[PDB]
Design an enzyme around this catalytic site. Structure first.
Site, PDB file in Angstrom:
ATOM      1  N   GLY A   1       0.933  -1.213   0.451  1.00 56.19           N
ATOM      2  CA  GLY A   1       0.212  -0.350  -0.170  1.00 56.19           C
ATOM      3  C   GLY A   1       0.613   1.420  -0.053  1.00 56.19           C
TER       4      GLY A   1
ATOM      5  N   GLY B   1       0.765   1.696   4.106  1.00 54.79           N
ATOM      6  CA  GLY B   1       1.308   0.904   4.914  1.00 54.79           C
ATOM      7  C   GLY B   1       3.282   1.432   4.218  1.00 54.79           C
TER       8      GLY B   1
ATOM      9  N   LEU C   1       9.121 -12.937  25.693  1.00 59.00           N
ATOM     10  CA  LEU C   1       9.187 -12.081  23.788  1.00 59.00           C
ATOM     11  C   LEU C   1      10.940 -11.681  23.582  1.00 59.00           C
ATOM     12  CD1 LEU C   1       8.678 -12.642  21.235  1.00 59.00           C
ATOM     13  CD2 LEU C   1       7.641 -10.227  21.204  1.00 59.00           C
TER      14      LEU C   1
ATOM     15  N   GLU D   1      13.372 -12.977  25.712  1.00 58.88           N
ATOM     16  CA  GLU D   1      14.270 -14.230  25.727  1.00 58.88           C
ATOM     17  C   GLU D   1      14.964 -14.434  24.174  1.00 58.88           C
ATOM     18  OE1 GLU D   1      14.580 -17.554  28.456  1.00 58.88           O
ATOM     19  OE2 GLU D   1      14.702 -14.918  30.004  1.00 58.88           O
TER      20      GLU D   1
END
Ligand SMILES: COc1cc2cc(c1Cl)N(C)C(=O)C[C@H](OC(=O)C(C)C)[C@]1(C)O[C@H]1[C@H](C)[C@H]1C[C@](O)(NC(=O)O1)[C@@H](OC)/C=C\C=C(/C)C2
Ligand SMILES: C/C(=C/c1csc(C)n1)[C@@H]1C[C@H]2O[C@H]2CCC[C@@H](C)[C@H](O)[C@@H](C)C(=O)C(C)(C)[C@@H](O)CC(=O)O1
Ligand SMILES: Nc1nc2c(ncn2[C@@H]2O[C@H](COP(=O)(O)OP(=O)(O)OP(=O)(O)O)[C@@H](O)[C@H]2O)c(=O)[nH]1
Ligand SMILES: Nc1nc2c(ncn2[C@@H]2O[C@H](COP(=O)(O)OP(=O)(O)O)[C@@H](O)[C@H]2O)c(=O)[nH]1
Ligand SMILES: [Ca+2]
Ligand SMILES: [Mg+2]
Ligand SMILES: [Mg+2]
Lengths: 440, 430, 69
Positions: A143, A146, A252, A254
């Protein structure tokens, strides 16, 4: 503490955010008006879901999220949908004119007219945190918004929050659902501009997801609704480490230590199992062994590539639901032998494993069967470079003739930005080549 | 998004009037401007072509221009002639006499300011204007000469908006005015430099469709214009109903125009049959697809087998299987791979809209950017050179103040346009 | 050891400041170039349209000159 702010950018980012926040609400028992009868601490609390939800005095649990788009029709659906009462009107920001699939309009012509307002709403959310961990940014590669606006936002976030960590969830283009012929341009431009501002990016290949939905769910012609619901399960698995707590749950951050061996090499390959319909799962209890095995099937990868033809630098398995360590040990033992998993010689420990005991959930009327156990694998393999190769080839074909380039130049861009972006991609493909070479 | 519609000259106002007819029923608007439909899908994007006035009355965002009072009197009397805003009628008296110089420089210049005031008025009321669309012919005087003058003036005041024309090319099979090649060439020279998208609606192909395919012994302007309305409704479906592909004029342009000058599209409609053949032929998605890419169905007198597609947009309307469509479109690309340039991957886009046009269960519209269009320009150039070789009729043009080499400028520019198409038709990926 | 501990912390602070500084300056200079480039593309296109308005008026004067004979 350890709060996370979610930023949903453009159509794909917005519609995937809608799928995610509905799934989060179901997982935590939050109602569409924000009430959470399970929560006893009113007005606040330091519970695990508080990393993603703030609380108001009246007991409302409010997503720590910003939805932003350059035109209104998509966010308008949020403003009037089932979860419209979940968000404060200021968390939804829309323009009047979109990027027209043109990175240059998203980064410059239109984006510059709404960037300050977006950064302002974000500051307001950050100010409600006691220990802000970082940002999750959801957007398409293809996009105009985006790609272009997401780049502008990321550059701005580096300036305003320094090294504070930013993770991306990106939709990689696929011709089966692609809305624009110029998506390879926007894809290379945003990837170049964002590489040094992103700590870790999870790429989802629309063609990979499209195929999985067709083959594993029996949907003859998948829609965005099918794709996003599946994507949201992957997103929920990754964030489940932050929203729940368990004795075997592993955070997360780690995983990130293991997953990113060098700054530029921050693109993990995701898989998810089981992906199965109610009809097929009616007579099929899937074991830790079966779902673990599925993580190594090339056809189950969220990006089309062949990890057998590459080298692993890390495998992180995020189990959830009815799973005990003994079963995981046996499953991996089997995979190590029956499979050809090749790790680089500079990574001593290749596997990292955690269990989140919260069972997987599914939205009523969705296509996924409700299963007792699930697993998400994040691996770092050189094979993911195949996705860069395929994009770069489409770029080169068009750019050799300067096809469509006048649209970007007319908006203020220079050709140099194109070849600069492309040369950066060339180095990235080379970087994936050198990490894979054995040590002297 | 909003679009401002402008229609100039006889042809422009004829096909424009038909355009408003066809789409007003598609959305459920009667000639009085009231809504009488049955699905909220008709009103979702109604503001693209209609203003809302007190009393839930919908008025076209349309401006009617002509140097000749005649044609606009009749538009007022035709069906839906009462739904147009009265102050938006801007008419002259003299007429243009198929004289490009009169429309562009003298007669049309005196009236252009009056049109500009109405265009500002209409763009003033737009929440976020997207651009303009113009209907006209290239062979006459007003729509041709004054048509391109309007584009020039509007582009000055709205440089960053999209300029979209529906341009009707002359054909001797349909008109006997011998100077139409002059008028068409002088204006093709303006379109190549001042519009972002131009649909090439060729009276030659329109006539041929009626004679050979439709088996119409002697086709009339009513016939020719029914193909135009059907086409125009097709190429604007994705602008008028909720969708994602080519949802606006700029996204269409960004997907269809790889190089600035090559913005001339060849459209096609389907299904198209003769009265006798309609009974023993059920319309299916494979039938629609095959017809769409057949040269017999092209609205421009070109054989796409003689060039190569740079970009293609395909719009299907009706209740059908999305999977069937995806398969039919892949197969046609497969069998005909040689006819698509390889340096533009994935250059065929397909949209599906749920509501069919009125009278059909299924329809399909084709928007091609093909180097084969050069055959259309070569034809006009051929007739231009025949006339200009003996300098037939220029004193009518030079008498308005025009210079001779202004004619050779236009012809030369059109020649470069032809070579440009050849250059990219012959280019390869290696 | 204590001089080195301050050395290290101050180097961490400096690399983070330089990161912010370069992002700030690269962004600023890109907004600037784009503004100039887009405004120049529009000026060029508009300069061209007026050069045609000039020719039209010359076409009108030309008509009257021949009009006196
Ligand atoms: C040599 O014999 C012919 C003698 C005439 C016409 C023709 C032929 Cl061939 N035709 C048909 C043509 O060659 C095409 C076209 O004819 C017409 O437009 C006309 C049919 C209305 C035209 C003359 O080439 C057009 C000029 C630019 C001229 C046309 C006009 O004089 N006005 C004007 O400004 O310029 C026009 O005004 C309505 C008057 C009418 C002339 C007539 C009938 C003589
Ligand atoms: C109404 C039709 C139906 C159809 C049903 S099955 C099939 C192959 N076609 C088509 C398409 C119509 O959009 C119109 C485009 C063609 C112009 C005709 C309306 C034309 O003007 C008219 C005089 C005709 O020739 C017919 C009335 C015979 C028309 O039905 C032919 C046609 O293809 O219409
Ligand atoms: N998975 C998924 N992909 C999507 C979705 N919506 C769009 N895409 C993809 O994203 C690309 C188009 O980008 P969009 O997000 O639609 O565009 P945008 O960011 O709104 O940009 P502009 O409209 O040009 O301003 C294409 O590759 C689409 O297939 C969605 O809901 N899910
Ligand atoms: N398809 C089509 N062509 C038309 C129509 N009316 C006129 N034309 C063509 O338009 C050309 C003349 O332009 P016209 O509109 O009459 O002149 P203007 O009023 O000076 O713009 C000729 O080639 C005609 O065949 C119409 O209703 N349909
Ligand atoms: Ca609480
Ligand atoms: Mg958008
Ligand atoms: Mg006429």
């Amino acid at each position: 503490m350890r709060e996370c702010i979610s930023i949903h950018v453009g159509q794909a980012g917005v519609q995937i955010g809608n799928a995610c926040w509905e799934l989060y609400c179901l997982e935590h028992g939050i109602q569409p008006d924000g009430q959470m009868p399970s929560d006893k601490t009113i007005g606040g609390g330091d519970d695990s879901f508080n990393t993603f939800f703030s609380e108001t005095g009246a007991g409302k649990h409010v997503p720590r999220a910003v939805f932003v788009d350059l035109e209104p029709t998509v966010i308008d659906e949020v403003r009037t949908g089932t979860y419209r009462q979940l968000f404060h009107p200021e968390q939804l920001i829309t323009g009047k004119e979109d990027a027209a699939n043109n990175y240059a309009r998203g980064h410059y012509t239109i984006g510059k007219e709404i960037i300050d307002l977006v950064l302002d709403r974000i500051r307001k959310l950050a100010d409600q945190c006691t220990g802000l961990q970082g940002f999750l940014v959801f957007h398409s590669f293809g996009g105009g918004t985006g790609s272009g606006f997401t780049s502008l936002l990321m550059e701005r976030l580096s300036v305003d929050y320094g090294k504070k960590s930013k993770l991306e969830f990106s939709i990689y283009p696929a011709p089966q659902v692609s809305t624009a012929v110029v998506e390879p341009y926007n894809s290379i431009l945003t990837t170049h501009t964002t590489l040094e501002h992103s700590d870790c990016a999870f790429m989802v290949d629309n063609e990979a997801i499209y195929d999985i939905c067709r083959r594993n769910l029996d949907i003859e012609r998948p829609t965005y609704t099918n794709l996003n619901r599946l994507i949201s399960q992957i997103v929920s698995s990754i964030t489940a480490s932050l929203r729940f707590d368990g004795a075997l749950n592993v955070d997360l951050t780690e995983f990130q230590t293991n997953l990113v061996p060098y700054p530029r090499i921050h693109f993990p390959l995701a898989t998810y199992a089981p992906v199965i319909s109610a009809e097929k799962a009616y007579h099929e209890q899937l074991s830790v062994a079966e779902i673990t095995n599925a993580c190594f099937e090339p056809a189950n990868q969220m990006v089309k590539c062949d990890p057998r033809h590459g080298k692993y630098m890390a495998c992180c398995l995020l189990y959830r639901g009815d799973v005990v360590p003994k079963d995981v040990n046996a499953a991996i033992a089997t995979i190590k032998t029956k499979r050809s998993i090749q790790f680089v010689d500079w990574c001593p420990t290749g596997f990292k494993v955690g269990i989140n005991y919260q069972p997987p959930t599914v939205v009523p009327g969705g296509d996924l069967a409700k299963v007792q156990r699930a697993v998400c694998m994040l691996s770092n393999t050189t094979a993911i470079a195949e996705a860069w190769a395929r994009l770069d080839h489409k770029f080169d074909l068009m750019y050799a003739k300067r096809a469509f380039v006048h649209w970007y130049v007319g908006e203020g861009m220079e050709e140099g930005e194109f070849s600069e972006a492309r040369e950066d991609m060339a180095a990235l493909e080379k970087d994936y080549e050198e990490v894979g070479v054995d040590s002297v | 998004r909003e679009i401002v519609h402008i229609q100039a000259g006889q042809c422009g106002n004829q096909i424009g009037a038909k355009f408003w007819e066809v789409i007003s029923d598609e959305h459920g608007i009667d000639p009085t401007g009231s809504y009488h439909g049955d699905s909220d899908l008709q009103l979702e994007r109604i503001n693209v072509y209609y203003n809302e006035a007190t009393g839930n009355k919908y008025v076209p965002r349309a401006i009617l221009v002509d140097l000749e009072p005649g044609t606009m009197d009749s538009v007022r009397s035709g069906p839906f002639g009462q739904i147009f805003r009265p102050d938006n009628f801007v008419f002259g008296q003299s007429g243009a006499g198929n004289n490009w110089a009169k429309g562009h420089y003298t007669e049309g210049a005196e009236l252009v300011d009056s049109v500009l005031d109405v265009v500002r008025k209409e763009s003033e009321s737009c929440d976020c204007l997207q651009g303009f669309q113009l209907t006209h012919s290239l062979g006459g005087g007003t729509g041709s000469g004054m048509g391109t003058l309007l584009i020039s003036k509007i582009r000055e005041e709205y440089p960053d908006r999209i300029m979209n024309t529906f341009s009707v090319m002359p054909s001797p099979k349909v008109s006997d005015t011998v100077v139409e090649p002059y008028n068409a060439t002088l204006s093709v020279h303006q379109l190549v430099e001042n519009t972002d998208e131009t649909y090439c609606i060729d009276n030659e192909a329109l006539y041929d469709i009626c004679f050979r395919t439709l088996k119409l012994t002697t086709p009339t302007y009513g016939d020719l214009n029914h193909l135009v309305s059907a086409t125009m409704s097709g190429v604007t479906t994705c602008l008028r109903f909720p969708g994602q592909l080519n949802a606006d004029l700029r996204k269409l342009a960004v997907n269809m125009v790889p190089f600035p000058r090559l913005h001339f599209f060849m459209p096609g409609f389907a299904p198209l049959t003769s009265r006798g053949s309609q009974q023993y032929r059920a319309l299916t998605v494979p039938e629609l697809t095959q017809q769409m890419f057949d040269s017999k169905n092209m609205m421009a007198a070109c054989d796409p087998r003689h060039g190569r597609y740079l970009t293609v947009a395909a719009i299907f309307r009706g209740r059908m299987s999305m999977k069937e469509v995806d398969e039919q479109m892949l197969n046609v690309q497969n069998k005909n791979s040689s006819y698509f340039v390889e340096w533009i991957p994935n250059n065929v886009k397909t949209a599906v809209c749920d509501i069919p046009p009125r009278g059909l269960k299924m329809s399909a519209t084709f928007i091609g950017n093909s180097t084969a269009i050069q055959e259309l320009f070569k034809r006009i150039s051929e007739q231009f050179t025949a006339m200009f070789r003996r300098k037939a009729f220029l004193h009518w043009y030079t008498g308005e103040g025009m210079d001779e080499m202004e004619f050779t400028e236009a012809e030369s520019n059109m020649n470069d346009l032809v070579s440009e198409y050849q250059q990219y038709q012959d280019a390869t990926a290696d | 050891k204590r001089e080195h501990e301050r050395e290290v912390i101050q180097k961490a602070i400096e690399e983070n400041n330089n990161f912010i500084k370069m992002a700030k300056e690269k962004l600023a200079q890109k907004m600037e170039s784009n503004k100039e480039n887009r405004e120049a593309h529009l000026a060029a296109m508009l300069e061209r349209l007026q050069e045609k308005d000039k020719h039209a008026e010359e076409v009108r004067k030309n008509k009257e000159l021949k009009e006196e004979a």
